[PDB]
Structures are given as structure tokens and as C-alpha cells.
Design a protein around this ligand. Sequence first.
Ligand SMILES: NC(=O)c1cc([N+](=O)[O-])ccc1NCc1ccccn1
Length: 294
Amino acid sequence: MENFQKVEKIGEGTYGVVYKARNKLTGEVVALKKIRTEGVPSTAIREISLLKELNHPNIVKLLDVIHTENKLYLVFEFLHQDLKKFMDASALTGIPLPLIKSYLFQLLQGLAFCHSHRVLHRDLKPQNLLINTEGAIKLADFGLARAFGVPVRTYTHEVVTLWYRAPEILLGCKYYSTAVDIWSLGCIFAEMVTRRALFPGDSEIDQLFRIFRTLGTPDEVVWPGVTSMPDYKPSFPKWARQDFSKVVPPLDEDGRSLLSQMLHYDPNKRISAKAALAHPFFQDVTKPVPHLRL
Ligand SMILES: NC(=O)c1cc([N+](=O)[O-])ccc1NCc1ccccn1
């Protein structure tokens, strides 16, 4: 805008371009997101505005929502790096388990908070998990999906990742629950551990089948109601479930146990963020500081 000073382009978001900017007045450095559109649904304005009150240490703070010239700018707290960049940078030696655990623990606190205030993320991915030099990790873009539907592309040619999408979403369920975020986080947890995406689908069906090939094709036994879901097809191949120890080696049994509960097919059986925080996997949780090259 005019009150800022575009420091640099932080890239293209899932709605619009994002700039690192400095408030000419407060002097604070922020992340400015330009959201796609001819008028901007006031329903979305109200929704988005409610999020300015969703404040938690593990949630990227939404500082301001500015609707002007029928344009929508979201002003966010700035963090220097995202988990996707950090995982790539740690790819050779992998992120230490104490840090993986700290991050997972903080992310779960963030989800617990959001979920208790009835706010879902719906599109969690390494790219929207931001970290700082103090060992903190925070969830970015919470609640935006609900206030901006679900578009195939960002808004202008760009393939949205399906890798972290919950199976109920892929089977066409129309009502999402807090469980979709636990699923995405489980996928992210597995990726930090193995240093490779758990389910790197390149199409919705490839995503679904990759999930099926690893966790077994779901049936009425493990997921009551699954065969009645909108996109379920009796013709889906039936793959047997793979041993978990083969999925995220060499994670210990505490870790494997928690991951398995975060990846339960039935959204209802899937562990909640609150319950997850009490899992024995976090018994020795600490807050290490990462090695960040900025
Ligand atoms: N809120 C933010 O700080 C932020 C926002 C978005 N975004 O797309 O909304 C993307 C990245 C961010 N920071 C990480 C970062 C910042 C600068 C250089 C490298 N990496």
C-alpha cells in the first residue's frame, strides 16, 4: 500500500502475493498478503476480522485486515523462515528428534487453542508453519480457508498441494471437522522424521491411493460410513495396511503410536490436539533452539 515499504516479495501465496514490509510509522516489519475478485464478500470480511482476536503464541498473529479499493490486504506478524525451507536445509542430517518433538508439541498447542475456539485451518502444510530463532514454531493462515472457500489453484495458475489433505476431504465430505488438521499435522510429523513427504500425491486420486497403499484401503470396519461418502467407489482397489514400523523408520514406538492415532481413518477416532498433548511421546519434551541461517 502507501503506509508501507515493500522490503521484498516473500513469494506467491494461496490467495495472492506476499510481501515483507515495514510500517513507515510504527517501524514494525510485517508480512503483507494481497488477497485476490470484484467487491470482496463482506461475509468473508466479518469472518476474517474475527480472527484478529485469535491470539496465541503458536499462531501467527493477524495484525490487521484492510479492505480498500475493493482490495483485501492481510497484515501478519513476520517470521523469518518456514518449515519447508528448514526441512530442506536439514535434509542431510535431518531435524534432531528433540526439535521435531518440540515443534510437534507447539503445533498441537496451537491447534488445541484454535479448535477450542471453533477455528479450523483446513490447509496445513510445511509452508505455513513459520519458525524463529528462539525455537518457536507457529501456524499461519488459520481460518482463511473457511472464509475463502476451496479453490483448485491459488487464484492464478499454481498447483495447490494435496499431500496433507485428510481422506474424508478427498472422499468428498462436505463438512470438515477439527480432525482434518490433526491429519495434516500427522503427515508433517512423518515428513520431519523421514525427511520425505508421507503421501506425495500428484492428483486427488493418486493422493487417495497413496494413502490407501500405506494405511490399507478403508472399509466399514475401520471407518463406519466410509462406503457412503460422496466420492467413494466400490471399485477402489483393496490394499492391505502396511506395518507402521516400515512407514516412519526409525521413529520409536511412542512416536509411532502417536502418529498412528493422528492418522486414524475415521475422523471420529482420530486423536484430538488436546489428547495428543498428553501422549507419552511428549513425556521428555524440551524446547531446543534450531540452527537457522537467515
Ligand atoms: N508471516 C510471514 O512471515 C510469512 C508469510 C508468508 N506468506 O506467504 O503469507 C510466507 C513466508 C513468511 N515468512 C517466512 C519467510 C520470510 C522471508 C523470507 C523467507 N521466509
